[PDB]
RNA sequence: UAGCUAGUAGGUGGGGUAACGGCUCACCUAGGCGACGAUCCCUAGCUGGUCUGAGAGGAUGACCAGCCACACUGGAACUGAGACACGGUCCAGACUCCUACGGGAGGCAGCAGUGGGGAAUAUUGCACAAUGGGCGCAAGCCUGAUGCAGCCAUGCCGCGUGUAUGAAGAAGGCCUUCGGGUUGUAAAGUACUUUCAGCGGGGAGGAAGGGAGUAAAGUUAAUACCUUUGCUCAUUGACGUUACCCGCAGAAGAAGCACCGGCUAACUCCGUGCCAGCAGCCGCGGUAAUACGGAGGGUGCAAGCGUUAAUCGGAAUUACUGGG
């Protein structure tokens, strides 16, 4: 429809590539971690889930996960590489 | 965000406001919380003119309603030493 | 020198009257192009030019009859806006022309050779007799 | 007596027909009015009861009974329908509406003129 | 195309035209845009009346608020339809001297004219009296309501002014000419759906529109309660079957504040 | 609203006097009264119960000049009130301001004072009341502005208001035209000759 | 409508949601609902409430308000605390419009308004003056919500359309036993008054605020800036030719609708003649009609009156109160 306010379309268009991407290149981190799963290798999967840690909770702190999503990754696979080791 | 505003009852060119706390996503006649009060702008010199119940109004103060300038206006006609 | 007045005198009226199947559509349709062409004329400076499509001869046989009522035009014309006033002409229509000849200052007088001057001609002079 | 009865099965109201299938409860309809004719009616009666089978514009074909003395109809001239029986001719519960449309009101009236569409004695 | 150079270089600018008072210059303010016809309008979805109008004094606003004179009422005003290459364009003001087109709904008739203030007239409506020729009869007659709005929708119009007797049958077209093809054409329209096919039927002259003072055409209706005839407008003209009747007529005197509303 | 027709058809029709033709002249016997109510006058009727109900009910309301919506409008206002309907209704008939009016002598009829009170000229409490169906307050004044004081139609139908019972509930002044009003009146004082009991039968079915 | 269910019921583990969750996948068992109505069909937004009814109940829930669902149809995602979105995006379908035919635009179940439907429902109006919402420190901007204006007797309420006097108990109509009665204090005449309309002048209240200037107290190094309170000035109304008040003139402009055999309020005459016709039921009209039509008169209601359509009561003729 033609509106003053259609700004706020494109620029969410700028927003789906840019945040998604992040989200995109977060999860790809998480799912390093679930090959370390499949890997065995306890001390791959501190390395992975030391490299993944802090860019997991940057995107929890930039209001793109609400930080209790990270936060149940960071449990559920803590309790999965502290009982694989 | 909570409030306290008029909510504009009465007739047809017969006003009769009703200072009222509710939110402001609320309509004017909508939902509201609790009714505190009341204001007629029409009620001249007689044995009532505004009814007006400063303690829930202190309570709600601090809560954190905002006050419009209405209702700034009826607290300062209230006054604590008049 | 306000512009006002300057395009006060930049605005005219042509009244248009004729006899029965003497030509005002034909005519109007080819001042739009003329109007269309002077469109064409003021689209025809610019980064780039759009026309509408000269109508195609497959579609170009195709044609209506009869007149009656009005059209009114503006114009977008270079120099001038000059304005048009399209009126039904027989007897018994151009009731419309006898109280829209008093709206237009000029008079165009169209009149064919095989039809000559008539009482249709005859009564559109009494009409504009009265106002010069 | 019996409640346990009523406890199984529930005490039912009667749900009476209206007498008008007016189509959810409408006070008047409008049909093409054809078959203008007249009737002879019940036992203890013997006149010639003008009526006119109505096809509605909802599809119903009901039959309404032309009141007043004189009318203009023929097969034809769109009228307004009202509702409220006869009890002179078996099938019509209906009656036509005179001030409406294309039926006219009856000519010279003077008294009971809300009935039969007849205005007021201008002169 | 040598048209064009003479239309620029022969024709002045747009002259002063007769009020009551005077002439009204080029010039001046308080625009002057009464309106010419009511045209027999080609209907999309809606009807807009048209306003062709005398605006030669005064530029445009687009927030403007004219004022009816003779019912002299403050209307506001902000819609005007510019006729750039016959297409109605989009709302635009412009430079006076133009016409324009409005959107009216049954209100403004033909000369009814605009000024800022100055309440007075022209010295236009040059409009004549009708030739009665026959009938509505209504052939498929479901749906009365196309013609009882959309030929009274016509009727303001200056060749067509539609007389509706009491017997709510039998609907006079009033033509002023002969060919009433127009309207037969024009009742096959979005909302013209009724054809209503003519024969021979004699109602004579004209009907001279005539509405006398209080007090006084009371028992004059009263009298010929049967001899009435509504017209386009709620007007009352007498019934004209022959000149004898208006013979009568005259001999009845029915002294009027007269306006001949043709 | 207003009747405005044969106010003394309606007194032979009912066959009591209905006050209807009070007026400066006393009891007239112009209208052959109690024998001829209309064309057909001679007749007697059956006269059955809900026949002595509404002749009752049509005999009070041309009495107080009340329509039917509004009587039945008093008939719920008087059924929620305590003590008995019947006392009550009768209390806000009386406590109509033409009736306080008519009760002072200010006109000869009901009408006259209905006409007084509509034509900006009976004022209560220094408030000017043109309705005629002012329910009446007790410890009230009521009288006529200084602009439409005794132009004469108050004076000589004030004379009547010597002729009158002159009741105890309401005291005139007679001086300066000021009234007084009272306490309300006791179902004992008020012309007793009606019956309450017929109208609550009619409007309680 | 007597069987329904296979992500079905439960558990373990992984993933997912702001969060429990077969919400979603891998494995194991056969469970789960159901005659105190499971599954299927039709209908329906729900409620506070409305109408009726002594109460219990019955229909309804349109306007006011709370929730849910929807935005030409269906599906899907992004933004954000909140949408899987009326005036945001994309795709698929239908219907229109433009095209220079390569391709695009649209979604009034918003306010207005039009076509069609139907017995039936409005103006393409004024303004943020007041409230509320959005943004801004604020001034200011938008607001078809709203405050109103216009139309419709749609419902309720009030007022008026005169009052007092006035017999020759006039004229005309109706009836008659042709004596007379009725219409009828009705009308004419006389004396007052003018509610409401017409016109001419004053004129509140809905108006709180906000702007400029000054003084005092806080703040700070600061008598500078900023917050707050008195105080001085110019002020902010679409309604609005406002409500209301005064004056001018003249009873002057303003009364109709149904019924009259019983139910149920009210009587005769004339015209047909089981015909025209009326009717809610009993039913009348067959040449002396209180039942049709017309006239007179009366009754009832009143700017409304009758008819039609729907709900309840009467109907204890759905009986739980309260039947056999
Ligand atoms: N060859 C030729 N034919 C012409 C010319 N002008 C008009 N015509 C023809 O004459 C006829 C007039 O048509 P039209 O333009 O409708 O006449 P009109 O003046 O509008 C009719 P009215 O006066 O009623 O409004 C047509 O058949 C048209 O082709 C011309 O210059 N050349």
């Given at each position: 429809?033609?509106?003053?306010?259609?700004?706020?379309?494109?620029?969410?268009?700028?927003?789906?590539?840019?945040?998604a991407?992040?989200?995109?290149?977060?999860?790809?981190?998480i799912?390093?971690?679930?090959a370390?799963?499949?890997?065995?290798?306890?001390?791959?999967?501190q390395?992975?889930?030391?490299?993944?840690?802090?860019?997991?909770?940057?995107?929890?702190?930039?209001?793109?996960?609400?930080?209790?999503?990270?936060?149940?990754?960071?449990?559920?696979?803590?309790?999965?590489?502290?009982?694989?080791? | 965000?909570?409030?306290?505003?008029?909510?504009?009852?009465?007739?047809?060119?017969?006003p009769?406001?009703?200072?009222?706390?509710?939110?402001?996503?609320?309509?004017?006649?909508?939902?509201?919380?609790?009714?505190?009060?009341?204001?007629?702008?029409?009620?001249?010199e007689?044995?009532?003119?505004?009814?007006?119940?400063?303690?829930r109004?202190?309570?709600?103060?601090?809560?954190?309603?905002?006050?419009s300038?209405?209702?700034?206006?009826?607290?300062?006609?209230?006054?604590?030493?008049? | 020198?306000?512009?006002?007045?300057?395009?006060?005198?930049?605005?005219?009226t042509?009244?248009?009257?004729?006899?029965?199947?003497?030509?005002?559509?034909?005519?109007?349709?080819?001042?739009?192009?003329?109007?269309?062409?002077?469109?064409?004329?003021?689209?025809?400076?610019?980064?780039?030019?759009?026309?509408?499509?000269?109508?195609?001869?497959?579609?170009?046989?195709?044609?209506?009859?009869?007149?009656i009522?009005?059209?009114?035009?503006?114009?977008?014309?270079?120099?001038?806006?000059?304005?048009?006033?399209?009126?039904?002409?027989?007897?018994?229509?151009?009731?419309?022309?006898?109280?829209?000849?008093?709206?237009?200052?000029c008079?165009?007088?169209?009149?064919?050779?095989?039809?000559?001057?008539?009482?249709?001609?005859?009564?559109?002079?009494?009409?504009?007799?009265?106002?010069? | 007596?019996?409640?346990?009865?009523?406890?199984?099965?529930?005490?039912?109201?009667?749900?009476?027909?209206?007498?008008?299938?007016?189509?959810?409860?409408?006070?008047?309809?409008?049909?093409?009015?054809?078959?203008?004719?007249?009737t002879?009616?019940?036992?203890?009666?013997?006149?010639?009861?003008?009526?006119?089978?109505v096809?509605?514009?909802?599809?119903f074909?009901?039959?309404?009974?032309?009141?007043?003395?004189?009318?203009?109809?023929?097969?034809?001239?769109?009228?307004?329908?009202?509702?409220?029986?006869?009890?002179?001719?078996?099938?019509?519960?209906?009656?036509?509406?005179?001030?409406?449309?294309?039926?006219?009101?009856?000519?010279?009236?003077?008294?009971?003129?809300?009935?039969?569409?007849?205005?007021?004695?201008?002169? | 195309?040598?048209?064009?150079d003479?239309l620029?270089?022969?024709?002045?600018?747009?002259?002063?035209?007769?009020?009551?008072?005077?002439?009204?210059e080029?010039?001046?303010?308080?625009?002057?845009?009464?309106?010419?016809?009511?045209?027999?309008?080609?209907?999309?979805?809606?009807?807009?009346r048209?306003?062709?109008?005398?605006?030669?004094?005064?530029?445009?606003?687009?927030?403007?608020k004219?004022?009816?004179?003779?019912?002299?009422?403050?209307?506001?005003?902000?819609?005007?339809?510019?006729?750039?290459?016959?297409?109605?364009?989009?709302?635009?003001?412009?430079?006076?001297?133009?016409?324009?087109?409005?959107?009216?709904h049954?209100?403004?008739?033909?000369?009814?004219?605009?000024?800022?203030?100055?309440?007075?007239?022209?010295?236009?409506?040059?409009?004549?009296?009708?030739?009665?020729?026959?009938?509505?009869?209504?052939?498929?007659?479901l749906?009365?309501?196309?013609?009882?709005?959309?030929?009274?929708?016509?009727?303001?119009?200056?060749?067509?002014?539609?007389?509706?007797?009491?017997?709510?049958?039998?609907?006079?077209?009033?033509?002023?000419?002969?060919?009433?093809?127009?309207?037969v054409?024009?009742?096959l329209?979005?909302?013209?759906?009724?054809?209503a096919?003519?024969?021979?039927?004699?109602?004579?002259?004209?009907?001279?529109?005539?509405?006398?003072?209080?007090?006084?055409?009371?028992?004059?209706?009263?009298?010929?309660?049967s001899?009435?005839?509504?017209?386009?407008?709620?007007?009352?003209?007498?019934?004209?079957?022959?000149m004898?009747?208006?013979?009568?007529?005259?001999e009845?005197?029915?002294?009027?504040?007269?306006?001949?509303?043709? | 609203?207003?009747?405005?027709?044969?106010?003394?058809?309606?007194?032979?029709?009912?066959?009591?006097?209905?006050?209807?033709?009070?007026?400066?002249?006393?009891?007239?016997?112009?209208?052959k009264?109690?024998?001829?109510?209309?064309?057909?006058?001679?007749?007697?009727?059956?006269?059955?119960?809900?026949?002595?109900?509404?002749?009752?009910?049509?005999?009070?309301?041309?009495?107080?000049?009340?329509?039917?919506?509004?009587?039945?409008?008093?008939?719920?206002?008087?059924?929620?009130?305590?003590?008995?309907?019947?006392?009550?209704?009768?209390?806000?008939?009386?406590?109509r301001?033409?009736?306080?009016?008519?009760?002072?002598?200010?006109?000869?009829?009901?009408?006259?004072?209905?006409?007084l009170?509509?034509?900006?000229?009976?004022?209560?409490?220094?408030?000017?009341?043109?309705?005629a169906?002012?329910?009446?307050?007790?410890?009230?004044?009521?009288?006529?502005?200084?602009?439409?004081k005794?132009?004469?139609?108050?004076?000589?139908?004030?004379?009547?208001?010597?002729?009158?019972?002159?009741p105890?509930?309401?005291?005139?002044?007679?001086?300066?035209?000021?009234?007084?009003?009272?306490?309300?009146?006791?179902?004992s004082?008020?012309?007793?000759?009606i019956?309450?009991?017929?109208?609550?039968?009619?409007y309680?079915?």
């Amino acid at each position: 429809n033609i509106k003053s306010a259609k700004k706020r379309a494109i620029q969410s268009e700028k927003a789906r590539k840019h945040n998604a991407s992040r989200r995109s290149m977060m999860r790809t981190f998480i799912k390093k971690v679930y090959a370390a799963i499949e890997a065995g290798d306890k001390a791959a999967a501190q390395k992975a889930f030391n490299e993944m840690q802090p860019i997991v909770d940057r995107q929890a702190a930039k209001g793109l996960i609400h930080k209790n999503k990270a936060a149940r990754h960071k449990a559920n696979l803590t309790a999965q590489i502290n009982k694989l080791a | 965000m909570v409030t306290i505003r008029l909510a504009r009852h009465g007739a047809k060119k017969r006003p009769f406001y009703q200072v009222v706390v509710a939110d402001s996503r609320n309509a004017r006649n909508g939902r509201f919380i609790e009714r505190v009060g009341f204001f007629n702008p029409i009620a001249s010199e007689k044995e009532e003119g505004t009814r007006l119940d400063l303690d829930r109004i202190a309570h709600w103060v601090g809560q954190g309603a905002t006050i419009s300038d209405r209702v700034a206006a009826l607290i300062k006609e209230v006054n604590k030493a008049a | 020198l306000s512009p006002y007045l300057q395009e006060v005198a930049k605005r005219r009226t042509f009244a248009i009257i004729s006899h029965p199947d003497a030509g005002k559509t034909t005519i109007t349709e080819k001042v739009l192009l003329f109007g269309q062409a002077i469109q064409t004329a003021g689209t025809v400076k610019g980064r780039g030019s759009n026309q509408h499509a000269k109508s195609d001869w497959m579609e170009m046989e195709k044609q209506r009859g009869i007149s009656i009522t009005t059209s009114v035009m503006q114009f977008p014309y270079h120099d001038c806006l000059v304005n048009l006033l399209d009126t039904p002409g027989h007897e018994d229509f151009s009731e419309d022309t006898y109280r829209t000849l008093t709206a237009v200052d000029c008079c165009l007088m169209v009149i064919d050779a095989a039809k000559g001057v008539e009482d249709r001609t005859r009564k559109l002079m009494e009409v504009t007799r009265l106002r010069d | 007596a019996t409640v346990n009865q009523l406890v199984r099965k529930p005490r039912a109201r009667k749900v009476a027909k209206s007498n008008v299938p007016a189509l959810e409860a409408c006070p008047q309809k409008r049909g093409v009015c054809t078959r203008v004719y007249t009737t002879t009616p019940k036992k203890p009666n013997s006149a010639l009861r003008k009526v006119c089978r109505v096809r509605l514009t909802n599809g119903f074909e009901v039959t309404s009974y032309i009141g007043g003395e004189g009318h203009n109809l023929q097969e034809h001239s769109v009228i307004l329908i009202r509702g409220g029986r006869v009890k002179d001719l078996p099938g019509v519960r209906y009656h036509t509406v005179r001030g409406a449309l294309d039926c006219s009101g009856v000519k010279d009236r003077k008294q009971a003129r809300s009935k039969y569409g007849v205005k007021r004695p201008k002169a | 195309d040598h048209m064009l150079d003479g239309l620029v270089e022969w024709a002045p600018a747009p002259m002063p035209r007769q009020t009551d008072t005077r002439t009204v210059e080029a010039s001046e303010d308080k625009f002057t845009g009464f309106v010419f016809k009511i045209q027999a309008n080609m209907d999309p979805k809606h009807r807009d009346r048209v306003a062709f109008m005398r605006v030669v004094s005064g530029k445009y606003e687009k927030g403007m608020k004219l004022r009816q004179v003779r019912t002299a009422k403050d209307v506001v005003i902000s819609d005007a339809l510019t006729f750039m290459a016959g297409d109605r364009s989009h709302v635009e003001e412009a430079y006076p001297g133009d016409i324009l087109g409005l959107h009216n709904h049954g209100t403004i008739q033909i000369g009814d004219t605009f000024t800022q203030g100055e309440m007075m007239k022209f010295t236009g409506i040059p409009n004549f009296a009708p030739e009665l020729f026959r009938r509505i009869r209504l052939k498929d007659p479901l749906k009365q309501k196309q013609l009882l709005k959309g030929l009274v929708q016509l009727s303001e119009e200056g060749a067509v002014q539609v007389f509706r007797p009491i017997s709510n049958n039998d609907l006079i077209v009033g033509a002023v000419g002969v060919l009433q093809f127009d309207v037969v054409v024009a009742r096959l329209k979005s909302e013209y759906n009724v054809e209503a096919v003519y024969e021979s039927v004699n109602v004579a002259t004209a009907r001279w529109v005539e509405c006398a003072d209080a007090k006084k055409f009371e028992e004059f209706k009263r009298k010929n309660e049967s001899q009435l005839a509504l017209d386009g407008g709620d007007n009352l003209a007498y019934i004209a079957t022959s000149m004898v009747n208006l013979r009568l007529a005259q001999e009845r005197y029915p002294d009027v504040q007269f306006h001949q509303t043709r | 609203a207003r009747y405005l027709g044969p106010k003394l058809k309606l007194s032979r029709r009912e066959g009591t006097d209905l006050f209807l033709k009070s007026g400066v002249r006393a009891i007239d016997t112009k209208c052959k009264i109690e024998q001829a109510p209309g064309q057909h006058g001679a007749r007697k009727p059956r006269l059955s119960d809900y026949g002595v109900q509404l002749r009752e009910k049509q005999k009070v309301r041309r009495i107080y000049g009340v329509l039917e919506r509004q009587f039945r409008n008093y008939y719920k206002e008087a059924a929620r009130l305590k003590g008995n309907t019947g006392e009550n209704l009768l209390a806000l008939l009386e406590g109509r301001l033409d009736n306080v009016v008519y009760r002072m002598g200010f006109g000869a009829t009901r009408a006259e004072a209905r006409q007084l009170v509509s034509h900006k000229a009976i004022m209560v409490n220094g408030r000017v009341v043109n309705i005629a169906s002012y329910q009446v307050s007790p410890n009230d004044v009521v009288s006529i502005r200084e602009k439409a004081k005794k132009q004469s139609r108050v004076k000589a139908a004030l004379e009547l208001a010597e002729q009158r019972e002159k009741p105890t509930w309401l005291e005139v002044d007679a001086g300066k035209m000021e009234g007084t009003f009272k306490r309300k009146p006791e179902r004992s004082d008020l012309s007793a000759d009606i019956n309450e009991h017929l109208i609550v039968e009619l409007y309680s079915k």
